[PDB]
Design an enzyme around this catalytic site. Sequence first.
Site, PDB file in Angstrom:
ATOM      1  N   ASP A 191      -2.952 -17.711  -8.220  1.00  0.00           N
ATOM      2  CA  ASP A 191      -2.621 -16.307  -8.065  1.00  0.00           C
ATOM      3  C   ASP A 191      -3.820 -15.378  -8.087  1.00  0.00           C
ATOM      4  OD1 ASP A 191      -1.474 -13.877  -7.963  1.00  0.00           O
ATOM      5  OD2 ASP A 191      -0.170 -14.112  -9.694  1.00  0.00           O
ATOM      6  N   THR A 192      -4.336 -15.006  -6.915  1.00  0.00           N
ATOM      7  CA  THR A 192      -5.504 -14.103  -6.899  1.00  0.00           C
ATOM      8  C   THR A 192      -5.225 -12.697  -7.424  1.00  0.00           C
ATOM      9  OG1 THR A 192      -5.027 -13.503  -4.611  1.00  0.00           O
ATOM     10  CG2 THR A 192      -6.441 -15.423  -5.010  1.00  0.00           C
ATOM     11  N   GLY A 193      -3.970 -12.325  -7.513  1.00  0.00           N
ATOM     12  CA  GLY A 193      -3.522 -11.041  -8.026  1.00  0.00           C
ATOM     13  C   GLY A 193      -3.415 -10.981  -9.538  1.00  0.00           C
TER      14      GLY A 193
HETATM   15  C1  LIG Z   1       4.071 -12.549 -11.282  1.00  0.00           C
HETATM   16  C2  LIG Z   1       3.929 -13.165  -9.885  1.00  0.00           C
HETATM   17  C3  LIG Z   1       4.844 -14.393  -9.773  1.00  0.00           C
HETATM   18  C4  LIG Z   1       4.295 -12.173  -8.769  1.00  0.00           C
HETATM   19  N1  LIG Z   1       3.526 -10.948  -8.860  1.00  0.00           N
HETATM   20  C5  LIG Z   1       2.278 -10.963  -8.112  1.00  0.00           C
HETATM   21  C6  LIG Z   1       1.100 -11.052  -9.084  1.00  0.00           C
HETATM   22  O1  LIG Z   1      -0.143 -11.293  -8.437  1.00  0.00           O
HETATM   23  C7  LIG Z   1       0.977  -9.779  -9.937  1.00  0.00           C
HETATM   24  C8  LIG Z   1       0.332  -8.655  -9.113  1.00  0.00           C
HETATM   25  C9  LIG Z   1       0.177  -7.426 -10.019  1.00  0.00           C
HETATM   26  C10 LIG Z   1      -1.090  -7.047 -10.437  1.00  0.00           C
HETATM   27  C11 LIG Z   1      -1.235  -5.967 -11.308  1.00  0.00           C
HETATM   28  F1  LIG Z   1      -2.489  -5.628 -11.714  1.00  0.00           F
HETATM   29  C12 LIG Z   1      -0.117  -5.242 -11.691  1.00  0.00           C
HETATM   30  C13 LIG Z   1       1.145  -5.606 -11.242  1.00  0.00           C
HETATM   31  F2  LIG Z   1       2.242  -4.894 -11.607  1.00  0.00           F
HETATM   32  C14 LIG Z   1       1.301  -6.708 -10.404  1.00  0.00           C
HETATM   33  N2  LIG Z   1       0.105 -10.084 -11.080  1.00  0.00           N
HETATM   34  C15 LIG Z   1       0.388  -9.757 -12.343  1.00  0.00           C
HETATM   35  O2  LIG Z   1       1.488  -9.313 -12.654  1.00  0.00           O
HETATM   36  O3  LIG Z   1      -0.613  -9.930 -13.230  1.00  0.00           O
HETATM   37  C16 LIG Z   1      -0.459  -9.355 -14.522  1.00  0.00           C
HETATM   38  C17 LIG Z   1      -0.794 -10.410 -15.578  1.00  0.00           C
HETATM   39  C18 LIG Z   1      -2.023 -11.206 -15.156  1.00  0.00           C
HETATM   40  O4  LIG Z   1      -3.184 -10.780 -15.902  1.00  0.00           O
HETATM   41  C19 LIG Z   1      -3.417  -9.385 -15.621  1.00  0.00           C
HETATM   42  O5  LIG Z   1      -3.544  -9.218 -14.209  1.00  0.00           O
HETATM   43  C20 LIG Z   1      -2.596  -8.257 -13.758  1.00  0.00           C
HETATM   44  C21 LIG Z   1      -1.474  -8.258 -14.768  1.00  0.00           C
HETATM   45  C22 LIG Z   1      -2.199  -8.588 -16.062  1.00  0.00           C
HETATM   46  C23 LIG Z   1      -1.240  -9.539 -16.760  1.00  0.00           C
HETATM   47  S1  LIG Z   1       4.438  -9.614  -8.588  1.00  0.00           S
HETATM   48  O6  LIG Z   1       3.522  -8.441  -8.483  1.00  0.00           O
HETATM   49  O7  LIG Z   1       5.403  -9.515  -9.731  1.00  0.00           O
HETATM   50  C24 LIG Z   1       5.365  -9.780  -7.114  1.00  0.00           C
HETATM   51  C25 LIG Z   1       4.889  -9.278  -5.911  1.00  0.00           C
HETATM   52  C26 LIG Z   1       5.670  -9.421  -4.764  1.00  0.00           C
HETATM   53  C27 LIG Z   1       6.846 -10.076  -4.807  1.00  0.00           C
HETATM   54  N3  LIG Z   1       7.574 -10.459  -3.757  1.00  0.00           N
HETATM   55  C28 LIG Z   1       8.742 -11.000  -3.954  1.00  0.00           C
HETATM   56  N4  LIG Z   1       9.679 -11.417  -3.147  1.00  0.00           N
HETATM   57  C29 LIG Z   1      10.982 -11.917  -3.618  1.00  0.00           C
HETATM   58  C30 LIG Z   1      10.900 -13.328  -4.193  1.00  0.00           C
HETATM   59  C31 LIG Z   1      11.515 -13.099  -2.813  1.00  0.00           C
HETATM   60  S2  LIG Z   1       8.907 -11.071  -5.678  1.00  0.00           S
HETATM   61  C32 LIG Z   1       7.330 -10.428  -6.022  1.00  0.00           C
HETATM   62  C33 LIG Z   1       6.618 -10.394  -7.139  1.00  0.00           C
END
Ligand SMILES: CC(C)CN(C[C@@H](O)[C@H](Cc1cc(F)cc(F)c1)NC(=O)O[C@H]1[C@H]2CO[C@H]3OC[C@@H]1[C@H]3C2)S(=O)(=O)c1ccc2nc(NC3CC3)sc2c1
Lengths: 99, 99
Positions: free
Chosen positions: A25-27
């Site tokens: 997960d690059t995000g």
């Molecule tokens: C949790 C993953 C499984 C999905 N996610 C993407 C991650 O990359 C998020 C990106 C993100 C970064 C942030 F900066 C702030 C955020 F709000 C979100 N990462 C993250 O939450 O990271 C957290 C944790 C990691 O450590 C630190 O880094 C950042 C923070 C922090 C603590 S998503 O966004 O929930 C997502 C996107 C589109 C989408 N499409 C869908 N389609 C349906 C199914 C058919 S469902 C769905 C879900």
Amino acid sequence: PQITLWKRPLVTIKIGGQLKEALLDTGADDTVIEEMSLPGRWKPKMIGGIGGFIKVRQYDQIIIEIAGHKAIGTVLVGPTPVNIIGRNLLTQIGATLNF
Amino acid sequence: PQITLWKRPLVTIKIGGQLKEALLDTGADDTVIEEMSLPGRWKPKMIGGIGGFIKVRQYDQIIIEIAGHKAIGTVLVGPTPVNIIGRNLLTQIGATLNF
Ligand SMILES: CC(C)CN(C[C@@H](O)[C@H](Cc1cc(F)cc(F)c1)NC(=O)O[C@H]1[C@H]2CO[C@H]3OC[C@@H]1[C@H]3C2)S(=O)(=O)c1ccc2nc(NC3CC3)sc2c1
Ligand SMILES: [Cl-]
Ligand SMILES: [Cl-]
Ligand code: NA
């Protein structure tokens, strides 16, 4: 490997002797994995994503294998919907995004 | 380019005639952008991530320019804390993860 993104980039990880599936997960800044038992002391951390915040347990210097690459680093344990391998460990296995 | 993961992989996007910064996110299936207007029809959707679900508006066949590369696809618009470019558009610009 060279991984395309037409499907979820799921890999097998090994931590605490057990195999698990996790998302590359690059995000994600940090690595977050579902409830499990890890050795040592933990520290608190509150991490935010889509929808809001969860409380997690932070374990440092944990041995973890990711797609067969050895890493040693911080693992956050908590009620995440999916196991996430974040940049702190993607950098240890030499991952880059390319286009 | 080759983007390393020492820092967040943030890039400039152009969408709906606006410039925005967005995260290249291999852990996201879908592209999710903060509240903005887009032209055309939309339908509601619920999407979940680490902290639960949010309600978004789903717009189909939207063109976006990502770090210089044009693509088209579905864009979800809603109260995400960060703009995220997900796999549905990363595939179109030929992005891959390599290690
Ligand atoms: C949790 C993953 C499984 C999905 N996610 C993407 C991650 O990359 C998020 C990106 C993100 C970064 C942030 F900066 C702030 C955020 F709000 C979100 N990462 C993250 O939450 O990271 C957290 C944790 C990691 O450590 C630190 O880094 C950042 C923070 C922090 C603590 S998503 O966004 O929930 C997502 C996107 C589109 C989408 N499409 C869908 N389609 C349906 C199914 C058919 S469902 C769905 C879900
Ligand atoms: Cl799409
Ligand atoms: Cl391809
Ligand atoms: Na449309």
